[PDB]
Every structure is written in structure tokens, then in C-alpha cells.
Amino acid sequence: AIKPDMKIKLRMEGNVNGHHFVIDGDGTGKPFEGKQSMDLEVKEGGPLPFAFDILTTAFNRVFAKYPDNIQDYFKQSFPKGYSWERSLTFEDGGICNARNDITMEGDTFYNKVRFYGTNFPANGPVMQKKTLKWEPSTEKMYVRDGVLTGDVETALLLEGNAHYRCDFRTTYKAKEKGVKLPGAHFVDHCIEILSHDKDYNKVKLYEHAVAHSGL
Incomplete structure (x- = not known):
């Protein structure tokens, strides 16, 4: 089903x-x-x-x-x-x-993304625009009550030699019942903004991810 080169189309509302x-x-x-x-x-x-x-x-x-x-x-x-x-x-x-929610039509993945955030302090680095990048991290994948779960403990680098920590938890669910769960493993990943315009209205993003067993 998956080809070596695939296209991505996305809309986010939030x-x-x-x-x-x-x-x-x-x-x-x-x-x-x-x-x-x-x-x-x-x-x-x-x-x-x-x-x-x-x-x-x-x-x-x-x-x-x-x-x-x-x-x-x-x-x-x-x-x-x-x-x-x-x-x-x-x-x-x-x-x-x-x-x-991710679907596939031909050679293209379609992404229906929703993003909601709250309780950010007005003086903090998110609302003041003080972030520089996410540090590379490793996602721990495991199964918790029958659902594939990924946990990450990471941080944003900020201006001023300071990190701003974030914990991620993701649950992942195939649409087809019957897709077998994996065993626990790790995914090393790195996400980078490659280019942007003045107020980040246009951004080019890159991500690299590699699964491994810790060895």
C-alpha cells in the first residue's frame, strides 16, 4: 500500500x-x-x-x-x-x-488535524514568542490497556539559555480491528523548522524518525 515516495496533504484547525x-x-x-x-x-x-x-x-x-x-x-x-x-x-x-485522523488516497496521505491549547500564561514563552526549537527526543512506545501509547519527556529551547519542559502522551489506533499491536520499542525523532517568513505564516518543516530497541 505504501510507496517509497508519498505525498502529504493537511488541514489543521484549532x-x-x-x-x-x-x-x-x-x-x-x-x-x-x-x-x-x-x-x-x-x-x-x-x-x-x-x-x-x-x-x-x-x-x-x-x-x-x-x-x-x-x-x-x-x-x-x-x-x-x-x-x-x-x-x-x-x-x-x-x-x-x-x-x-489520517487516511490514504492513492499516493497521498490526508490529515485532518485539530489542536487546542489553553492555560498558557500571558507572560510565558509561548505567548511571548520566545521559543527556538524542540530538542531531539526518544518516544517510548508501549501498550497500555490494549492501546499503543507513546510517551516523550522533552523540551523547547528558549532564548536565554533556558529550556521549557513538556511531556507528551500519544495514543495511536488503527481503523481496522485486527492490526496487531507491536511490542515495546523506541522512536528517536528530530523536528526542525527549515525556513519561515516574518511571522511564521509560511513555514517549511522537516521530521526524521527511526525506531529501535535501545541497543
């Missing part, structure tokens, strides 16, 4: 601290090499009054290099697809909930 926005994405990636890139454009609500970096992990673990010895739940979920739901808990009380 609200952070009351601020509504809509963002469209178009990109390409290489599922078996674990790489993807995309161009994002804010369509409504720009310029966004918060750090673009909080959104970027919401803009598909199909794009991850899986070795033969770990079951690849994401590639096995196609063609019908899968969905994920994520919580982002930041160290100052900011909270985000995000979801994506």
Missing part, C-alpha cells in the same frame, strides 16, 4: 488561548527512510500570537524507519488508516490536546 486559526500543509516524504517535509501556510488567524513551535509535532509515524524486528503498526494500518490523540503538558501549566 484554538490556543482563545485564538482561532486554520493552517494548510502540503509535503512529501519517504516512509521507509523515516523522513518527511512539508510547507505550511496559515490561512486564517494570522499572524499567530503564540509560538509556532508548539504546533509542529501535530503536523504521522508512518514516516519512521522501522527495522524488521519491530512490528510497524503504522505501515500495517494502511490503506484504511489510523488516528492519534495527544496531550502536551508544559511545565508552566499550559496544556494542549491534539488529534489527527
